[PDB]
Amino acid sequence: APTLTARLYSLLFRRTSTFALTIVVGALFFERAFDQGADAIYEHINEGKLWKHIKHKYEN
Amino acid sequence: AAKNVVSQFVSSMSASADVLAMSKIEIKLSDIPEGKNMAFKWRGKPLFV
Amino acid sequence: ANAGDFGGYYCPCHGSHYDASGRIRKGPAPLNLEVPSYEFTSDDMVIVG
Amino acid sequence: KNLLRNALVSHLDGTTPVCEDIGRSLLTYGRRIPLAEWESRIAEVDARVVREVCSKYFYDQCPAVAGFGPIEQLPDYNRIRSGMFWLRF
Amino acid sequence: AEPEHDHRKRMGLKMLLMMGLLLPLVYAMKRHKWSVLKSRKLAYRPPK
Amino acid sequence: MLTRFLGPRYRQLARNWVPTASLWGAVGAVGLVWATDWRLILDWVPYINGKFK
Amino acid sequence: TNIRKSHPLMKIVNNAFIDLPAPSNISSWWNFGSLLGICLILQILTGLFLAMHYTSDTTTAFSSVTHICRDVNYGWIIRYMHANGASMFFICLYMHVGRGLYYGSYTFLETWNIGVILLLTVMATAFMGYVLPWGQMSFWGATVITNLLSAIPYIGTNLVEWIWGGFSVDKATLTRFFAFHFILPFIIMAIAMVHLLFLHETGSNNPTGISSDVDKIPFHPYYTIKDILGALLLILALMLLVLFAPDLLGDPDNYTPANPLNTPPHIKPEWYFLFAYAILRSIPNKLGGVLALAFSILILALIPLLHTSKQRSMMFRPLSQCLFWALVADLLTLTWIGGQPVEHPYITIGQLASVLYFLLILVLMPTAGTIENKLLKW
Amino acid sequence: TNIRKSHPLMKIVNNAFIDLPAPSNISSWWNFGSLLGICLILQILTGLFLAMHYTSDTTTAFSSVTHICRDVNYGWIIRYMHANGASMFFICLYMHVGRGLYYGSYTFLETWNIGVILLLTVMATAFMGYVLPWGQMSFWGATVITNLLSAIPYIGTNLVEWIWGGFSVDKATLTRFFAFHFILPFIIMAIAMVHLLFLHETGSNNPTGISSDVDKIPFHPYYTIKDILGALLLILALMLLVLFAPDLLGDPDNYTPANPLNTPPHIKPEWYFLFAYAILRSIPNKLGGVLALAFSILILALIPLLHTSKQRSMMFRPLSQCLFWALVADLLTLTWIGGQPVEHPYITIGQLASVLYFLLILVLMPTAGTIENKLLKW
Amino acid sequence: GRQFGHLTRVRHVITYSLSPFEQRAFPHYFSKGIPNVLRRTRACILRVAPPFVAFYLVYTWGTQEFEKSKRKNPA
Ligand code: HEC
Ligand code: HEC
Ligand code: HEC
Ligand code: HEC
Ligand SMILES: C/C=C(C)/C=C/C=C/[C@H](OC)[C@@H](C)[C@@H](OC)[C@@H](C)CCc1oc2c(O)c(OC)cc(OC)c2c(=O)c1C
Ligand SMILES: C/C=C(C)/C=C/C=C/[C@H](OC)[C@@H](C)[C@@H](OC)[C@@H](C)CCc1oc2c(O)c(OC)cc(OC)c2c(=O)c1C
Ligand SMILES: COC1=C(OC)C(=O)C(C/C=C(\C)CCC=C(C)C)=C(C)C1=O
Ligand SMILES: COC1=C(OC)C(=O)C(C/C=C(\C)CCC=C(C)C)=C(C)C1=O
Numbered sequence A: 001a002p003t004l005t006a007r008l009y010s011l012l013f014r015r016t017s018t019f020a021l022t023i024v025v026g027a028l029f030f031e032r033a034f035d036q037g038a039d040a041i042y043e044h045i046n047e048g049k050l051w052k053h054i055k056h057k058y059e060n
Numbered sequence B: 001a002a003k004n005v006v007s008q009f010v011s012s013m014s015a016s017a018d019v020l021a022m023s024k025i026e027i028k029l030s031d032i033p034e035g036k037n038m039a040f041k042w043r044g045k046p047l048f049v
Numbered sequence C: 001a002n003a004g005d006f007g008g009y010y011c012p013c014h015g016s017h018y019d020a021s022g023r024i025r026k027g028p029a030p031l032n033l034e035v036p037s038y039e040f041t042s043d044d045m046v047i048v049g
Numbered sequence D: 001k002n003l004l005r006n007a008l009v010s011h012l013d014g015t016t017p018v019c020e021d022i023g024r025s026l027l028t029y030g031r032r033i034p035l036a037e038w039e040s041r042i043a044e045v046d047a048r049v050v051r052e053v054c055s056k057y058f059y060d061q062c063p064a065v066a067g068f069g070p071i072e073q074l075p076d077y078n079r080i081r082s083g084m085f086w087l088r089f
Numbered sequence E: 001a002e003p004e005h006d007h008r009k010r011m012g013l014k015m016l017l018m019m020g021l022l023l024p025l026v027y028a029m030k031r032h033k034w035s036v037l038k039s040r041k042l043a044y045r046p047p048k
Numbered sequence F: 001m002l003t004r005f006l007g008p009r010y011r012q013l014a015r016n017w018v019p020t021a022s023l024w025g026a027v028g029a030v031g032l033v034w035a036t037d038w039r040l041i042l043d044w045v046p047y048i049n050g051k052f053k
Numbered sequence G, H: 001t002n003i004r005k006s007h008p009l010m011k012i013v014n015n016a017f018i019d020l021p022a023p024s025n026i027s028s029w030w031n032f033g034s035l036l037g038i039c040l041i042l043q044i045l046t047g048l049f050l051a052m053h054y055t056s057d058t059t060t061a062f063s064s065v066t067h068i069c070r071d072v073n074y075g076w077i078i079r080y081m082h083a084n085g086a087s088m089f090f091i092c093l094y095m096h097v098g099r100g101l102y103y104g105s106y107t108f109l110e111t112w113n114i115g116v117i118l119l120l121t122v123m124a125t126a127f128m129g130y131v132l133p134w135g136q137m138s139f140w141g142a143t144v145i146t147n148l149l150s151a152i153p154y155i156g157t158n159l160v161e162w163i164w165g166g167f168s169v170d171k172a173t174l175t176r177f178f179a180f181h182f183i184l185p186f187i188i189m190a191i192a193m194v195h196l197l198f199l200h201e202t203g204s205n206n207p208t209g210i211s212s213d214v215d216k217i218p219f220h221p222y223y224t225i226k227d228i229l230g231a232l233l234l235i236l237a238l239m240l241l242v243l244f245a246p247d248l249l250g251d252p253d254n255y256t257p258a259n260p261l262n263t264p265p266h267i268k269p270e271w272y273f274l275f276a277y278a279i280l281r282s283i284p285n286k287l288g289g290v291l292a293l294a295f296s297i298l299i300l301a302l303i304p305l306l307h308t309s310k311q312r313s314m315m316f317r318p319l320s321q322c323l324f325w326a327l328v329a330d331l332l333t334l335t336w337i338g339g340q341p342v343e344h345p346y347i348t349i350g351q352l353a354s355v356l357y358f359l360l361i362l363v364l365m366p367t368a369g370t371i372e373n374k375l376l377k378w
Numbered sequence I: 001g002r003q004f005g006h007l008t009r010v011r012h013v014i015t016y017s018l019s020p021f022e023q024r025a026f027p028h029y030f031s032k033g034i035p036n037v038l039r040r041t042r043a044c045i046l047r048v049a050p051p052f053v054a055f056y057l058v059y060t061w062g063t064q065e066f067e068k069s070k071r072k073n074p075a
């Protein structure tokens, strides 16, 4: 009853509509956080290299 | 993942890199007599001077 | 060009009557014809876009 | 509600069921709960209470299931579990 | 020969990371349902 | 002519299903907004910002 | 124990085409269902043999179609069988709908509703098909009909450009229209099976609108032979058109190549779009005109909710018979107006005919059914 | 009374995908059936979106495919999903056949025989597909495989020229190959339904080859969830190939345009034709080589007549297990030889492997089954 | 899903039929056939024809009116 999976179930999972709402709201914030991360990993593993890092050489 | 393949598939039907950003056209004014509509092509769709 | 009942333009698709301003007067069409961005370079030529 | 008032009153009819009820109730409740109290408890129940109290025990809960006899067509337990909630709700 | 080269490798890293979430998760989903069968116990009780 | 479905029970049945039908609309609105990247609504959302500045 | 009756595949054939209990009773107006199937496979077969030689590029599309008609061994029959079969497909559709309307067959809700989808799908298919030879009617046909989507507020423009492939009808438009036009008849074929599946659940209606279980006959040999005769009449009607008048039902303007700078003076639809065309242009409003067009065909789905009569069929309903024929003649009026220019007498009478179309179905035919009920003390 | 159980359409879905009694029992080797369906619709969907931009003329066909890969928004994933899905289609086919061979599933005669048609149809479809981008492998692929018909005596030449459109592979060949390649997956889809219809008559076999009616479980949720997992592995295997190695399973020579004057030095089939290729060229005879090729796939239809064993499955048959794996490894040998030039060690070992393929199925596996019967005193 | 033997209940009805090879396909084809078509026509003419003449009148008038309108006289 202190436990967090319990309160997750009680507030959000018990009803299928709330379950669906928590998935769609969940999917919005996942798409941001994953694309933020996975781009930043890909960009860091290719340190210069891409036209995003070349950009500043040719002017405004 | 469903969003991504579906969007990518949706995007393939919309306007490709082959057709983007079309240019101006120069038309000489004195080449049309007073009282006539002259039918030019611009951006693929007719231009009326 | 030079068709319909306001001396300008007639679209033969569903009976749109435009005047010599390009303004819609009769028939189904909601809006006046698209005015492009243009300038005159002096008074010999017109460049459009 | 009416079916329960009729069941309760029709049950406590004869020396024997009343004696059972005195005996049993003192073991379980520690009092005899008088007929007028049950009626008060029955009367309180409305649709909101039935929806609340059924949801508490039934909705999305794991049943115990017992099957005996020609039971090939007895639904699989996962499909009995799935019958314990509604996707529309 | 291949202007897509950098884009396909970007989507590839996303594919691998997504699959590293989804493959153990769908596995758990499938195992959770197969629980009822995989732990089931049989007894045979014939007469006399 | 639809008068079959008008009375106290159907009034209660509609009242019961209202929070659910409201939440299914709330599901579908966000789902449309998410699927299309609906620019009009997502500019408000304080962390979901693909457009700079 | 019969091989015909118990084999898992032949089962399906037997319960549809052989042992199927059918009314003793059903007239020539019931021939159009099989005729639509014949039309479907005729269009599939010719369409396949046209696809073997057609190229879907703007530079070459007109050239390939005329290459078919001049160079390809018997390419001309195939091309004009296809063209006139599409018009045959529409004659049969309209007869089939009208039969359903008259005889109260729409009370089969699922069969009828699937039928409405089938009408819309075959309309969209045949629009696409006409775009393919890349004549003048092809191009502006493609322009106008795609642009109907631009009347959907906020997103309509994005949608039109989405299906076009860019800012105008172009290279991208024709290649996808070939692809869309290829697959859609097979999707139609699948929906035709679901149409038949829902039908077999009840069996057929009949001229009287009275249940006929008291007097069913086996589909074979009676309706197998009546269907063969009916198909042989369909072959006559088709082969009269391809061999004696191949271009009677088409447009001469589609024999000039597409030209994005000039829309022709005379432009009308293919004959089978003329009523709906007449309805849309009777309204001097963009949103209302297209809403009326959508409503002119989607109305068929309201017809079951508006059936007031205590009888199913129009056979014993003279007031309804009169108003049915007013509907056919009004539809004949609307296809005449569709054929004419937007000028003085034609604008008003086309507006009045549009109003009458919607007034007949919505108001006048339901009221006729009530009056007829009251006259029989019902 | 359930809506799922009695609605005429949902009935079909419920009796196939939900309430269908399936063995408690069936392993990962049973995942390939659904995976073939996933493959079928993947190829349909990508193939449709490729058809939206592809042109089937010889001048322009190579240009359209590269227009897809460079200019079309995400045209590259669609193109290589399609390419690698075709190879995925073959991995799943071979697993699916081998499962059937091992577990004695061929004793379902109709299901199996329809399966053999499905193999031949998907082979012919994928041959056609490879002709379409009009690379060097496309042209000579089209040349050789069409010419197999020229081995039919008296009429074979007339037949090859009949499907070509003339004396050589040409303009006419490519336009019809696009048309044939478009329709055939839908014909496949229809045959896949008849395949499933014959199967549902018995339900599934299982690893033991013993009847499992004593222990059936509902298809949902057990095999719905096992199928989802299996599909997610199929997506991994596919998306590894398109995103990390798009050209691993194809040929670099198909990136040079078709050239009727030069056949390349190195030419081999697509990996999934290599065994059958190796069989045909092991015979230094025209008629015999093509007869062996036909027989290398049509043999599967003899396998039910050659089942000697008193058990269905190979699970309790160790002699047969060994000889099954000799068959797989011999098939792996034949795809290796198919990959190599017709020179010294390769000619003989490929001839011996060809002989072993036919000897294993015809002679050695039936004899193994009899020995195994005799060893169990059966 | 409907089969003979399961359709409906019928009692006390006798049906006499003849073989196709015992009887004519066109029994009295013109002698009885013509009187029938005329009878069927009479039955329905008042229901079918008057909307189509009403089309015909609006057709004839409309074509005539359009023709006359694109002529002038005193101007
Ligand atoms: C919008 C209505 C509608 C359309 C369009 C329609 N159907 Fe039907 N169809 C029906 C109805 C209703 C029936 C039942 C008729 C009855 O029993 O009197 C039916 C009956 C039929 C029949 C068998 C009995 C008969 O009337 O001949 C076939 C076959 C048929 N449909 C196939 C088709 C095909 C093929 C198409 C074209 C793709 C199609 N239908 C278009 C509504 C329609
Ligand atoms: C296998 C592909 C294929 C199928 C199936 C198909 N067609 Fe076509 N159709 C074509 C091609 C290619 C053309 C272009 C040649 C031509 O204009 O005749 C075409 C042309 C047409 C035309 C224009 C006729 C003309 O020349 O003026 C119409 C209308 C048409 N199709 C309607 C239909 C209808 C209705 C169906 C059945 C629902 C159908 N087609 C089935 C490929 C197909
Ligand atoms: C030459 C043999 C063969 C080929 C090729 C084949 N099938 Fe099958 N298929 C079978 C047999 C036999 C079974 C029954 C397996 C069993 O019960 O053990 C079957 C079972 C299946 C199943 C369901 C059970 C399972 O094994 O997963 C599906 C679904 C399937 N087939 C679809 C397909 C599709 C789709 C194709 C590709 C068009 C195809 N099959 C190709 C012979 C084959
Ligand atoms: C709606 C039409 C369509 C369908 C359905 C289709 N494809 Fe294709 N396929 C194409 C086109 C167009 C191409 C040419 C583009 C290309 O080469 O990738 C093609 C290309 C191919 C190629 C050559 C791949 C390459 O580029 O090297 C193969 C192999 C193939 N298809 C096999 C299949 C198989 C297997 C199926 C499913 C039975 C199938 N296709 C379904 C239209 C289709
Ligand atoms: C990918 C997107 C797709 C396939 C969208 C498809 C939409 C399809 C429609 O619904 C099915 C449609 C065919 C249907 O409308 C209900 C018709 C009866 C429309 C009739 C129609 O024809 C015209 C035509 O043929 C022309 O050329 C000769 C030119 C035209 O203007 C001058 C028209 C026209 O003004 C109308 C209303
Ligand atoms: C309209 C007529 C049609 C559709 C006729 C279709 C016939 C289809 C066949 O049966 C289905 C066929 C595909 C099937 O044979 C059993 C294959 C496994 C054949 C394997 C195959 O591939 C080759 C190939 O790919 C090549 O190019 C790279 C070139 C080749 O030579 C050098 C071959 C080749 O020598 C063989 C035997
Ligand atoms: C119960 O009424 C029925 C009829 O009596 C009027 C028919 O004549 C036909 C014959 C229909 C054919 C040949 C078209 C088949 C369509 C496809 C797509 C294969 C059917 C199915 C039917 O159900
Ligand atoms: C009794 O065994 C069965 C399975 O158990 C191994 C399946 O998994 C599937 C699932 C198959 C699918 C999704 C492919 C459908 C194909 C088409 C063309 C729509 C079927 C039908 C089946 O019968």
Ligand code: FES
Binding pocket: C011, C012, C013, C014, C015, C016, C027, C028, C029, G144
């Ligand atoms: S397109 Fe001009 S009037 Fe409709």
